[PDB]
């Protein structure tokens, strides 16, 4: 037997683990990661099986964005049989993975017209282009919702067959399915990947042990690039992944009710958004904030909890105000510096990566897992994932001008989403005075690379030393690839 | 001899029609250039038929009849304007200021009014086979709202436009004089009648003017003038002052929209609209408060609310624009919610009043109706329920009005817009129901005032409530 | 038996347990209660040693209020030697009970003038009458605070020798001191007090056991009256105690700093308030909401968490916005139906109660513990606590008119404290329409008893069946005592 | 000729006209100006006799500011006898000039701490230094006011003998007193001052006439510099005066009541402020906005009317909300480009100026009139007016750094005064991004001159062509004086 080590116990690590263990009787597969799931994105997720719900005008204006969207639409088709195959290893008492079949997208005025109006139109267009079943519906026909009238939706979009899963029941089902197929769970973290003669030898663990392997799959979420970056040359050949720190909450509803569908807005300032995912047992999930952090953070800020709760109680259901808080959850969306995932092989024989999936790795997991396992078996996996190979020059999916327009719009959107109340001249004054500093920052960081808006705002408000370290990083990447 | 009492749109419109149709008779029109409490000069004005539609109005038979008359009036306006402009020159300016209207739906209001009323307007347009289109908000020209106050739906109504009310008044006066009418700039103090017939009018300079016909179109003063005649105090429904505040603004860049911009009718028959004017001016309107006594000056509250709504919901550029005039006028507000149009039990005594928000729009139809009746005709088919000598109409159940007055009260909050703890609205709804139910039960066993008047009565002095209880009891005695 | 059983493991149970064990070395004292401390007030407390800080105009306008205040002033004097005696049983690593020596009371406009202006004046007058060391200080001289300018204080009052304790370190010190003095901890709950021939026999526990005793001291917080009410006649002779559900939070500050003093407002709508209590290790405590509930609740509502966080970030320090949330805490202030504590003996020989202390049982604990132990030893304990004996007709400390004025003012204060933004006619309209329903409720409940504002609002918005049950309760109490 | 022509019929022109006519009975004094008083500051004034009420920390931090304040304190002493001398020419039935004897300054939180807190402390210090009678009073003792509780004052300062006049009754009394003393009113405007051989010959009027004179006193408000600048060399020797456009209103109060004192805040963003001046007959005056405009404007903007009304109804009396609006008034405060008035003689014999008095020309009028008449008679007038001579290099009363700090604080104050509601990170973000653009503008305008904050904000948001014209102006002034 030829040993495979999967580093990471989120949706991506476990999904690849399950696929390898089921497909490869010739391999012993060991999966690393602790039950604490420190900084874990997956346990903090609702989660929405978001393909069309995730559409933004800005994403679909780039070739790379359209390619990512096509993969999300393909992933949706795999979910019914994937769920069936995971539930089959359990019993009724393990609970149901699927919590909703459909999604309603709501349009209210608690946000920027330049994001919410543009994104609602882009979602409609993407659905029509895909010939996907959907209907614009009367807001009056949306069941369950009880918004503040001043925060109410005036348009609503029903998307058929775009639903949600319980992320906790999914994780439990993946672990159980992994064990059933002969996989071994080793509850320790990788400290170091060992390689020599251009080949992986295995992994040093944080209990001081060494585990030998012919294949190492890195699916360590936001830690994935930092782990691989220690190997020779790879610090400037694997795009950096940061922590997209997200806050969500589990609430026991006042009357034990919940909506029959996912309820969501389109993506909002700096890839945040508002949604409610149904759960069993009189619980609802509400999400979810997003802030790119240059270092990991495992606790919610006061600001994040207040913003999430204020949005949900005003825009979705005022009944949530009197509902009991059961849990505040925090996890790190793996946020790639060039805005696209890191999926496939490396220049190191037997070294694979599955990371940088940001807001929709959980949704894409069955497709991504099958792609990487096909590559490991000498196949070509899924068409169109070649552009997202982990060992690459940074992608430039947008012009600097497009990103500078976007970062100012997203900054203004943090105001409109609050929502603020300002003198009417103040917004245009702030727009005018935001342009110059962001243009200056972009010019200073690099002659060739521009970070997307989500990362550019984090860099703008970081320490001088952190900005200078990123200037050096971008210059070493340019040197490596040009 | 014919005497028209009142120099608003209704008095002058009937004056012009009489003078043009009866060249053998002397027609004299009373009223002063000051136009004290005058509704017409304070109007934009919108030729609002479909724009005026509410779910609540169209749920009553009387409301559907009023709406049918508004739709009929629209058809008369192009030829009416042509006939008034024909008596003038290019230099008098144009009566028509816009051909079309855009209705905007934003969330700066109550869902129970704005969502219901937008759906009712759409249905009314489709039922009437009126040309209209739901349009993308992005395609509405000129507007620059606060994003948190922006519309998410917009409705283009073709051939529903606006007039300059000042140029209309000047054109009516000029057309009246051209047709042989006489303007006598004094007020009527008293209508003289004996042996069941009008003799004429005593004026406030002490003179007596004889007449075979007296047409009362004195706006909110109309019923008080006729109520002095024997028996008529409890046979002519009372008319109150629907005090409205509007403003003329010189825009920062001299621009204006090509269409009327408006919301549907809001709390207590207020609303937000912009009517285009010539010369880099726009009209913004308009507040509404039923007052048991007349008021000729704007409150601070009314000016701030009108300006706040226009700058946030229509165009932030209006914030830096110059205020040219704050206008105040009294919408004639009938106690039973419907106009007073036609003849009386007194031979030669006619009334044209109680038109509230849309007398100006209905004026050519109403003028032609009353002139047809004066000539022995039957005028316009659907006006019979709105005869001025009547028992008070009960167009809605007490329950419907109690639901409406609580919704309108809550709408004053959502329209501000307020920011409150989330439990407060349901708490206020619960504690508003009892007092309004108690007031309604106390006022009368049979009559219920509509929401606009019920809120004014709720917050009036005990003595004013008791006087209204006596009024309602004397009306019941008279008609039952 | 000369055995003593203390029922409850909060500050009051443990404080009386320690005093009994130290003063009666020949007797076995057993203390009941579980480490979970379900609904526990003490673990959720900051806690402030609040005497002058707790002063309201409304409390000091009643004879009973002035008597309660005199006891709080007396309790303050006991704290230095009490803390010394508790720390003496531990070592350096157990940490310090005292976290601050002084308090600053802040006056801002994020509240009702009828509460905050009246209460600030009452605190000043109480300090001057007691000849207590204090100073009105310039707001600019208050260290650490960084309020939103629109939420800033314009007056500030320094109170010397009014400080705070770490409630967690206090509980650990009381348990350790109890063991050191020969006390036994039995981690089970009392289900039933056994009595016959007018005398306590002991306690049935929830593991089915029977523990014999000559003395039973009930300090079970908000459960105290429900436990004793099962004994013959006592349902209408021991005033009911409800749950004053309070939400607080532990925050790790952005820079590890904290204030050197307690920072607080005066008591606000329905005995809520805003305060920050210093803690060791770069943590601060923020508190604290209050809602009287007719049934217990062990979880924070969304509303409570948002209100607490919004007040602290605007009125105390905007830096708390970016600070990490470590814990949301929930506990039940024991809320007596007649507004005064239940301290002393009963008509049942050997049955004692220490409860109904609402906002300041922790502060009064050393005085209350010494009072009850003196009574148990045949003394008269502390002068002025005989009015607060647990077996009594309901106190009527205020006229019905005073309470109706108070409940409308407190209702309006929930608006001003938010703070709301309303059309200027709405407040007077709401005041006018609130008076009638509260007058009607008060008249319907009883001809003789009026619940204080905090309880009256809970009864106003309770189910018809709960109102009717309270009407019957008040009628059975009147029958028993008249 | 020994004939005197006064150009201007505001408080300054009429005050100097009265003093000349009374002191020189042997000479013909003619006063020009029309009853419309186009752009007139005086008729739009309340007016407050503001000396201590006008104190700001920023003004008193400069030597020129302390000199201006000393003149305001000296002017206050003249008012009782000045009023007596004007009322003596009339009867009871002419009405009373004085409408209040005293002023209450209110401190609320509807503003920037960096202006309102600093200015309240500066007012207190200035009063103590001048030995002026005053008292800090309980807010509860301020009669009449009925603020929104969230907008209420927490501190109040009673200033004795700092009152108000009815500006309309003052103008009528000055005209009557002028005629009584032999003055002639000629209701036309001056178009041109004629001078040759370094001496005034007289004035061309806008009806084409020529009026000869040995003395011409220019008190034409904001038109005063434009009139004199036409004479040879004077275009860069007389500092420019702009229009400080101010909006005020007359309101008939709901019940005919008014306060017994002036009610005011200290000066606020860009020399705006909130005040109520009592009037006879159930009327109150409310003021007053301020905006420096590079061209005159005779109509109120929507923004100005809403801001004035919102502040008065929330911060002074909610009863004003239901009160009737009688008149919106607009006048131009003469706003000198270097921040100080233009008072005294010129290089042209017999040519005098009284202008650039901004917020307190009306208050200073009796002192300024006496100063100019003393100079015309060969005296030295009032001590300390020498720096404010009209023919001068632009004053630099503050460092560029002081003005840049001030303009950012005033910009932020437009937010806090609204008052806005924003996410807590936004204010520091806006402060950071406002500094650079104002620093850049200041550096670009001139190497030596810096406009005060009120003018700098108007220049920042003016057209490029208007900025360039001001750069040229500053360079021509530097050339003339260096
Ligand atoms: C703010 C506002 C906005 C409006 N907007 C619109 C709009 O968009 N569309 C629309 O269709 N309509 C609008 N209206 C007007 C509405 O249609 C009215 O119902 C209509 O204008 C009433 O006309 P009237 O001639 O009956 O009354 P008025 O216009 O009030 O004319 C009555 C006249 O009679 C005079 N008078 C009083 N007593 C006497 C007496 N004793 N003798 C002689 N004369 C006397 C008065 O001084 C007055 O000039 C608006 C009104 C207001 C106040
Ligand atoms: C948010 C908040 C903030 C506060 N802040 C302050 C402050 O700043 N200053 C101050 O002085 N005080 C403060 N307090 C506390 C206040 O003084 C309380 O009145 C006091 O803590 C009550 O103590 P207790 O021991 O009576 O009750 P608790 O602390 O409730 O203890 C009772 C214990 O008995 C247990 N129990 C219940 N039933 C049984 C049973 N059948 N058998 C055995 N055990 C049982 C419970 O689980 C619980 O642990 C605060 C409280 C809250 C909720």
Author numbering:
A (entry chain A), C (entry chain B), D (entry chain C): 10 to 491
B (entry chain D): 12 to 491
Provide the authors' own sentences about this structure as they appear in the paper:
Here, we report a noncanonical FAD-dependent enzyme Orf1 that adds a glycine-derived N-formimidoyl group to glycinothricin to form the antibiotic BD-12. X-ray crystallography was used to investigate this complex enzymatic process, which showed Orf1 has two substrate-binding sites that sit 13.5 Å apart unlike canonical FAD-dependent oxidoreductases. One site could accommodate glycine and the other glycinothricin or glycylthricin. The resultant product is no longer sensitive to aminoglycoside-modifying enzymes, a strategy that antibiotic-producing species employ to counter drug resistance in competing species.
To probe the importance of C281, we mutated it to alanine or serine and E426 to Q426 (a residue related to NOS-formation). Biochemical assays confirmed that the both residues and the NOS bridge are essential for the reaction to proceed, as neither one led to the end product (Fig. 2a (iii, iv), d (iv, viii)). Residue R342 turned out to be critical because the sidechain of R368 was misplaced by intruding into the glycine binding site as manifested in the crystal structure of R342A. Next, we performed coupled assays to detect the end product to see if it could be formed by complementary pairs C281S/R342A or ThiO/R342A (Fig. 2d (vi, vii)). No product was found, suggesting that (1) glycine imine (the product of ThiO) is not the intermediate for R342A (with intact C281); (2) the first-reaction-phase product formed by C281S is water-labile and unable to transfer undamagedly from C281S to R342A. In terms of conformations, the mutants showed no difference from the wild type except for the sidechain of R368 in the R342A mutant.
